[PDB]
From a paper:
The crystal structure of [name] was solved at 1.80 Å resolution in the P212121 space group. The asymmetric unit contains one dimer of [name]. Each subunit adopts the typical GST fold with an N-terminal thioredoxin domain (β1α1β2α2β3β4α3, Ser2-Tyr88) and an all-helical C-terminal domain (α4α5α6α7α8, Pro89-Asp223). The glutathione binding site (G site) is occupied by a mixture of glutathione and glutathione sulfoxide refined with equal occupancies. The sulfur atom of the reduced form of glutathione is oriented towards the solvent, while the sulfoxide group of the oxidized form establishes a hydrogen bond with the Ser14 sidechain. This Ser14 is part of the catalytic motif ‘SPCV’ at the N-terminal end of helix α1 of [name]. Interestingly, the Cys16 residue part of this same catalytic motif is oriented toward the solvent and could be responsible for the thiol transferase activity observed with HED, as observed previously for other Ser-GSTs harboring a Cys in the catalytic motif. The clasp residue around the axis of the dimer was Phe103, as predicted from the sequence alignment. Both Phe103A and Phe103B interacted by Π-Π stacking, similar to GST Delta, while most GST Epsilon structures had a His. In summary, the overall assembly was stabilized by a combination of polar interactions surrounding the hydrophobic core of the dimer with the clasp Phe103 as a central and crucial anchor point.
Glutathione transferases (GSTs) are enzymes found universally across all kingdoms of life, spanning more than six decades of research. In insects, they play pivotal roles in various processes, including detoxification, ecdysteroid biosynthesis, or chemoperception. GSTs were categorized into four types based on the catalytic amino acids, namely, tyrosine (TyrGSTs), serine (SerGSTs) including the Delta and Epsilon classes, cysteine (CysGSTs), and atypical (AtyGSTs). All the GSTs’ classes identified within the insects are recognized as dimeric including the Delta and Epsilon.
Author numbering:
A (entry chain A): 2 to 223
B (entry chain B): 4 to 223
The structure:
């Protein structure tokens, strides 16, 4: 690419896919640098100098290095979008989208990372019931947030959906999202998948991740 | 002002918003929400905030929640200058990263400890949960580096959000100054601001003493 934008990532990370989705909706070219987490490429001296959290995604926008999928997506829309539909400039509307992003970070992501991180770090394959309960609590809140609106922040697709949709696509690694229990979540996930660019970026990597972790568990709750 | 804050003082998330209101010199009405009586679960409350959390802000008929979202709103709407939440997009991205780090790492690590207590009366804390809190502090220590504040040389929303959250962490973990000298020094630095100590310190001590009195097992 000649945009000067570089994304450091791996496709099985939902946080990375948030950024790919954002770059796609903004029609931005970029260079994608695959970071091999299994080889510890995120822990190298040169990587950690740019991102001391040693996470993906990281964005290099023409010499400006930023990380955290939420912060990256908000930056990209404000800098590069031609309209504000994904991330409204109106302060009250922006506060709704921000709230949903902080909910993804603090509740949805946190609940599923609580399950997966012990696996990646310490090979833990036994998942306490308490952790599955916390995932369900987050799904119930999402179900209520969706209400009668098609998207997470209202009638239009926003960064709220591009952030939370991928995270929720990882949840089935640990919990079944039963449509009869979570019909609004289910309908929303299906609605996102009706957007070709979304399904193309999200669906196969999400399936790969879920199948992988489901093959690992030796005990899933009580 | 027509601004109303719904909250309780022992919540660090609520204190973030009180600190923001204070630095912006905004007058407001403080409506205490009695979480122990379930006032956050009433029909009227959940109609405005389906997450049934504090803080919630009513800015003249606009209801918003989540301390990070509230604080960002308040600075962009009401501040004279953008020092707490820069308009430059790269600087904003650093402050936002810090806020999302507070939400996804620091807050999540300590809520993982406290929530089972408040919901189910769990008083036995697995070592894994304490390890997660330490991992978050280690990252914070690296973020601080040699800069006095979390996002660099000036105080920002990064500090007003993360400082109060970190003031709750001693409920479960000791913040050892030999392991976390920069975190320690930063927490002391915030407390040298009179408005910060006045809002934060006594409620933080109350919370920490309360939960420390309840634990029957703290890790291994
Ligand atoms: N709040 C951040 C989370 C990034 C993250 O956990 N990334 C994982 C990959 S999986 O989704 C990662 O980089 N793990 C390596 C590590 O933390 O060491 C964001 O939204 O970008
Ligand atoms: N990400 C949100 C966290 C709010 C929260 O959990 N608040 C607690 C009080 S402790 O700090 C609360 O309202 N608990 C009641 C509940 O969730 O039912 C924010 O920053 O505002």
């Amino acid at each position: 690419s000649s945009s000067g934008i570089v994304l450091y990532g791996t496709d099985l990370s939902p946080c990375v896919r948030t950024v790919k989705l954002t770059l796609k909706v903004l029609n931005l070219d970029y260079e994608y640098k695959e970071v091999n987490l299994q080889a510890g490429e995120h822990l190298s001296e040169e990587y950690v100098k740019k991102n001391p959290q040693h996470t993906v995604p990281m964005l290099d926008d023409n010499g400006t290095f930023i990380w955290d999928s939420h912060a990256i997506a908000a930056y990209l829309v404000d800098k590069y979008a031609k309209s504000d539909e994904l991330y409204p400039k109106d302060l009250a509307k922006r506060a709704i989208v921000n709230q949903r992003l902080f909910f993804d970070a603090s509740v949805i992501y946190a609940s599923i990372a609580n399950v997966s991180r012990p696996f990646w770090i310490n090979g833990v394959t036994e998942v306490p019931q308490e952790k599955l309960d916390a995932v369900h609590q987050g799904l119930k809140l999402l179900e209520t947030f969706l209400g009668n609106s098609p998207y997470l922040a209202g009638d239009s697709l926003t960064l709220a959906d591009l952030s939370t949709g991928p995270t929720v696509s990882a949840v089935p690694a640990a919990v079944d999202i039963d449509p009869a229990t979570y019909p609004k979540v289910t309908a929303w996930l299906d609605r996102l998948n009706k957007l070709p660019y979304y399904k193309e970026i999200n669906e196969a990597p999400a399936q790969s991740y879920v199948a992988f972790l489901r093959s690992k568990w030796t005990k899933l709750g009580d």
